[PDB]
Design an enzyme around this catalytic site. Structure first.
Site, PDB file in Angstrom:
ATOM      1  N   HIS A  41       0.815  -1.214   0.000  1.00 22.67           N
ATOM      2  CA  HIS A  41       0.000   0.000   0.000  1.00 22.67           C
ATOM      3  C   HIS A  41       0.846   1.260   0.000  1.00 22.67           C
ATOM      4  O   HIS A  41       0.287   2.353  -0.159  1.00 22.67           O
ATOM      5  CB  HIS A  41      -1.023  -0.010   1.149  1.00 22.67           C
ATOM      6  CG  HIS A  41      -0.471   0.101   2.536  1.00 22.67           C
ATOM      7  ND1 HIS A  41       0.245   1.195   2.980  1.00 22.67           N
ATOM      8  CD2 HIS A  41      -0.634  -0.702   3.621  1.00 22.67           C
ATOM      9  CE1 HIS A  41       0.550   1.033   4.258  1.00 22.67           C
ATOM     10  NE2 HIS A  41       0.027  -0.108   4.672  1.00 22.67           N
ATOM     11  N   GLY A 143       2.779   5.887  10.832  1.00 19.40           N
ATOM     12  CA  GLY A 143       4.153   5.757  10.403  1.00 19.40           C
ATOM     13  C   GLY A 143       4.838   4.466  10.796  1.00 19.40           C
ATOM     14  O   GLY A 143       6.012   4.286  10.445  1.00 19.40           O
ATOM     15  N   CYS A 145       3.808   1.441   9.810  1.00 23.49           N
ATOM     16  CA  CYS A 145       3.540   0.424   8.785  1.00 23.49           C
ATOM     17  C   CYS A 145       4.900  -0.130   8.311  1.00 23.49           C
ATOM     18  O   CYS A 145       5.820   0.707   8.099  1.00 23.49           O
ATOM     19  CB  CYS A 145       2.714   1.056   7.640  1.00 23.49           C
ATOM     20  SG  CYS A 145       1.153   1.704   8.355  1.00 23.49           S
TER      21      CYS A 145
HETATM   22  O1  LIG Z   1      -4.116   1.674   9.030  1.00 21.58           O
HETATM   23  C1  LIG Z   1      -3.469   1.877   7.961  1.00 21.58           C
HETATM   24  C2  LIG Z   1      -2.239   2.500   8.017  1.00 21.58           C
HETATM   25  O2  LIG Z   1      -1.714   2.906   9.208  1.00 21.58           O
HETATM   26  C3  LIG Z   1      -1.494   2.716   6.753  1.00 21.58           C
HETATM   27  C4  LIG Z   1      -0.218   3.450   6.761  1.00 21.58           C
HETATM   28  C5  LIG Z   1       0.860   3.205   7.606  1.00 21.58           C
HETATM   29  C6  LIG Z   1       1.960   4.059   7.482  1.00 21.58           C
HETATM   30  O3  LIG Z   1       3.038   3.865   8.277  1.00 21.58           O
HETATM   31  C7  LIG Z   1       1.967   5.106   6.561  1.00 21.58           C
HETATM   32  O4  LIG Z   1       3.033   5.933   6.433  1.00 21.58           O
HETATM   33  C8  LIG Z   1       0.886   5.331   5.743  1.00 21.58           C
HETATM   34  O5  LIG Z   1       0.901   6.353   4.840  1.00 21.58           O
HETATM   35  C9  LIG Z   1      -0.211   4.506   5.852  1.00 21.58           C
HETATM   36  O6  LIG Z   1      -2.020   2.352   5.551  1.00 21.58           O
HETATM   37  C10 LIG Z   1      -3.230   1.724   5.470  1.00 21.58           C
HETATM   38  C11 LIG Z   1      -3.686   1.350   4.213  1.00 21.58           C
HETATM   39  C12 LIG Z   1      -4.906   0.706   4.084  1.00 21.58           C
HETATM   40  O7  LIG Z   1      -5.355   0.344   2.850  1.00 21.58           O
HETATM   41  C13 LIG Z   1      -5.674   0.449   5.212  1.00 21.58           C
HETATM   42  C14 LIG Z   1      -5.215   0.818   6.474  1.00 21.58           C
HETATM   43  O8  LIG Z   1      -5.987   0.554   7.567  1.00 21.58           O
HETATM   44  C15 LIG Z   1      -3.987   1.467   6.615  1.00 21.58           C
END
Ligand SMILES: O=c1c(O)c(-c2cc(O)c(O)c(O)c2)oc2cc(O)cc(O)c12
Ligand SMILES: O=c1c(O)c(-c2cc(O)c(O)c(O)c2)oc2cc(O)cc(O)c12
Ligand SMILES: [Cl-]
Ligand code: NA
Lengths: 301, 301
Positions: A41, A143, A145
């Site tokens: 993603h 952040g 992820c």
């Molecule tokens: O809960 C989510 C989430 O935290 C993140 C994410 C984490 C990061 O560290 C980022 O930098 C960022 O931009 C997005 O993406 C997502 C994408 C989805 O499709 C659904 C989600 O639930 C999340």
């Protein structure tokens, strides 16, 4: 003596964390050999999150759409591909700190350490369990992820989890390092909910054994039970069924303490039926279920 | 979201752990620059545990009576000295993995991470607090002496604890890295007992603020309290007194949540009186006191 929730030492994984940027999205990646792994993603913008076509989003990307940063050094991306829900970025430099490792998919009830990271920088480490409903009760902020979960077996790092998302309950969902989700979840912003959770019975028994090893014995009694009778109680209290394999796995602890599993099951049965009567076990007023039998042996022997 | 007892990533400390042997005694040491720090009781034999004279034991030792092993490499000891209860071994090689570091003495209520080690090899990492009675509720087995506690705020490791001994109740005692014990304890195996312990009130309040930040308000009430009335009540539950310094420390969390410090004190008074009536706070059925105000700001949104 004493009993603590304990994580594996994280040094071998710290040397693998990098920052991955695609457009205005920045998250964490895992750098092993000459490949960086991160959630797919990362290629989504906000206009894509609700119904992303990942095939089409990726074929539109080129190597130059990705910025990988290892500390203060930029890694040049020379290839990109998707495996399930994980993006693989080939870089021109193999990580000199790559540890001995394997990718391993874990089962519900098993525990692992998480190295929480932000912007590619390790921030903390904690121990957690894969819940029966395939979520984890993590601690993650925006952040995080791409943070990974792992075990260490002898000298080999077994990577088992990559963090993808937070669900509305506040619990967390992710994949193995081959990009396969744990649980019935998809990587989209949509109506998604954890199913009703259950308690990990074999882990509760393991923790009762740890309590006995540590001198907490008040819940022991003269009674024994059967798997059949106990599992009707377990179903009653939303506890996972206890299987014969679970019983065999606790064999060691049963032999070391003199409390057969069905003997300890009679204690747990009684604790479920009547309760703790105002007392604690290992400093907790709840029945703890995120220690495996392995975890108890490792820490108590 | 979520809330976990979170340790610092341990890699910077893992690269400093070594094994120190003198006679038949082996324990852990901390290798920083060209000095190895370890508990001075490494120079005791079985006859020297009750009333050792460390000055007399040490003057009998040559540099070559100390075996220091860094993984598979034996380090050559070229000098030795004692600073309070810590032995310092000069070696002929500066540790190339030495991190940015400093030595700090902490106060009761402060938290830190512990890297539990055996035979110079890291086993696990966990979080803990210096109790008001100057013990820590660790998880240590035979051979863990010399394991250290630390924080890593920013990029600098602050070493605050070295493990020396287990007390009869199973709690743990040790020193700062200048070899001064926390509390009234001494490195003799004569009968020593931890004082009655108490709950770290300012940390419980910080954790209630964390609960509000994470979206839980069920425990608040319409009342307030004076500081003095709060202390009169809380001390009847074996809580530490809350000082004006503590109230000032909680100022930022009070501002972020909109709940005056003495209003949160009124909520805590009511929780002590009522219990939780089947509910939990941040996953716990008891009031947690090993998260500091600083920790809550570190981990929470
Ligand atoms: O809960 C989510 C989430 O935290 C993140 C994410 C984490 C990061 O560290 C980022 O930098 C960022 O931009 C997005 O993406 C997502 C994408 C989805 O499709 C659904 C989600 O639930 C999340
Ligand atoms: O509790 C104690 C303890 O554990 C050790 C120790 C730790 C190790 O890791 C060893 O290898 C070892 O030989 C001794 O020394 C002690 C010395 C005292 O004067 C008093 C103690 O209470 C301990
Ligand atoms: Cl302090
Ligand atoms: Na029984």
């Amino acid at each position: 003596s004493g009993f603590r929730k304990m994580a594996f030492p994280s040094g071998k994984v710290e040397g693998c964390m990098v920052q991955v940027t695609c457009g205005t999205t920045t998250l964490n990646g895992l750098w092993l050999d000459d490949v960086v792994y991160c959630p797919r993603h990362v290629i989504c913008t906000s206009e894509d999150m609700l119904n992303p076509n990942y095939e089409d989003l990726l074929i539109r990307k080129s190597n130059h759409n990705f910025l990988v940063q290892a500390g203060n050094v930029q890694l040049r991306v020379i290839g990109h591909s998707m495996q399930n829900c994980v993006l693989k970025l080939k870089v021109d430099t193999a990580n000199p700190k790559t540890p001995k490792y394997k990718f391993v998919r874990i089962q519900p009830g098993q525990t692992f350490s998480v190295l929480a990271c932000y912007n590619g920088s390790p921030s903390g480490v904690y121990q957690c369990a894969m819940r029966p409903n395939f979520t984890i009760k993590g601690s993650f902020l925006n952040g995080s992820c791409g943070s990974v979960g792992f075990n260490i077996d002898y000298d080999c790092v077994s990577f088992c989890y990559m963090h993808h998302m937070e669900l509305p309950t506040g619990v967390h969902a992710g994949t193995d390092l081959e990009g396969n989700f744990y649980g019935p979840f998809v990587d989209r912003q949509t109506a998604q909910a954890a199913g009703t959770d259950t308690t990990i019975t074999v882990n509760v028994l393991a923790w009762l054994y740890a309590a006995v090893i540590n001198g907490d014995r008040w819940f022991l009694n003269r009674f024994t039970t059967t798997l059949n009778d106990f599992n009707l109680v377990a179903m009653k209290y939303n506890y996972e069924p206890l299987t014969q394999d679970h019983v065999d796995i606790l064999g060691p602890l049963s032999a070391q303490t003199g409390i057969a599993v069905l003997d300890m099951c009679a204690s747990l049965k009684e604790l479920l039926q009547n309760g703790m009567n105002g007392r604690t076990i290992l400093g907790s007023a709840l029945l703890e279920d995120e220690f495996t039998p392995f975890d108890v042996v490792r820490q108590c022997s």
